[PDB]
Amino acid sequence: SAYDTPLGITNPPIDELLSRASSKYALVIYAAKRARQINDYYNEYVGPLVEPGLQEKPLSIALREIHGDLLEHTEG
Amino acid sequence: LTSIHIEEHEIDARDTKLGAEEITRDIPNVSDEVLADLDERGIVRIGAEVRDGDILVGKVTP
Amino acid sequence: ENFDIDAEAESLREVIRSGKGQKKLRALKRLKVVAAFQQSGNSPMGMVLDAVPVIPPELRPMVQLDG
């Protein structure tokens, strides 16, 4: 199961994210709320956890983080 | 395969009940740059290159 | 004003039971609208207007055109 390397938005790969959260629909909010938090930190102020890029976006950071298993979620 | 494309832009000094409309160069709230292309009439001179936003006909409503 | 929804609704539930056939259908067509007004918090007094509402002006606009 080799893809050489991902690039841009397709990094990180979705199948490795779907393992982490219950479903893509959860993963969306999972990433989104975290991203809204990361957005807020620059201005709930926790993060960024993983060492971010120089000019990197909160969505990329959030979607990177979920893949790393630095976060945990509760389904309402 | 280059084409010439000619577009028409109309405006009318219609009468209102407050005063009357007039096509004139002088506008209260502008700079010299945007009315440099205009002439004594208050319309852009023949051949002055216009950009999307630039004034063509200076008209004032009462 | 001179109306009692409960008695009317009740009677209609009997007149359907009494005359089974074509008139039961009419009494049952009559029943549904009456039966609804019982459980409804709003009174059927509001079916008539002493005052009529007026839509916000902007949704019926009078704007002068370029002329």
Added chain:
Amino acid sequence: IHARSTGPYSMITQQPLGGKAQFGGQRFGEMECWAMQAYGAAYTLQELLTIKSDDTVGRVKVYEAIVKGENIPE
């Protein structure tokens, strides 16, 4: 070719006035909404049919929020 981040809004209808000439936005129709629902991009549709079109407090706040670089208000 059309483009519109923000500009003039129409007076009678509180969505962006449509047209190439009038510096207008594009029509996000029902068949577009069905595709969006069929994905289930709830927030996307709930952005498109609100702050990105109709909502007078949303259309003014979204620009400020984006240019300041804050969270997009609900």
